[PDB]
Amino acid sequence: GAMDEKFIRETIETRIMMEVFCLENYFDKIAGSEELLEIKGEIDDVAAAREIFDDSDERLHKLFIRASGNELIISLYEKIWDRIDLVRHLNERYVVSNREHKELIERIISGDKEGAIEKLKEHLKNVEAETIKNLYTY
């Protein structure tokens, strides 16, 4: 099939399914992880947010999945990662996605589980909307 609106929407919906489940169910492990603080540091360390982005982005989303310790979930996420990576490269949103990550991280470390789950959904839906908005602006 084509690289089209449906392909994009399916990718982001799958991410919401997986990443939000893991954030919700492994919230305390994520919040307590050294990896989270390292990612936060990498974001905080710069004003922009092109260099910051690709690393920090993959690391943050993959952390939520890894924290499950469920090797089947981890493997399924790795299986679809090239597709996830394609879709993220369709539209450059470094500054704004970075801001959303930073806010997500602060909700997590401050213990606002309900708000972190909301922010992760909002973030993925925002990314989706902007990617679809720009599908014909190449």
Add this chain to the structure above:
Amino acid sequence: GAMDEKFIRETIETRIMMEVFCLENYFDKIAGSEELLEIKGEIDDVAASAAREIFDDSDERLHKLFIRASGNELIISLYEKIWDRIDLVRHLNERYVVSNREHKELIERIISGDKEGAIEKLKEHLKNVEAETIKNLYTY
């Protein structure tokens, strides 16, 4: 790795992740489907005690329906990828009568519009299946 408790628990957790997401987000499509009613009919057409022939066919169809209703081909394809594993785990412990009862209750919650209760029942069903499979991992 081994076919052990962790393997089993990971399988059921994955199913809860996928199937509950799809039931929650495509509830009205599932509730309105002809397939759901065909499955219910197949369950209702034999005694609670006769679930064995019932079971394999109705069970795969019911769980796969939830996924299919998403219309998300990536989700559908990932569920298909893990299906042989799901099918292994279900075969580890024979629970035909009781799982069939749980399917019937789940279906009734769906067709009656009780979305919150259907989601609860699906989770309870998968967790009940998990617990019994682990309970019996050394009773072979």
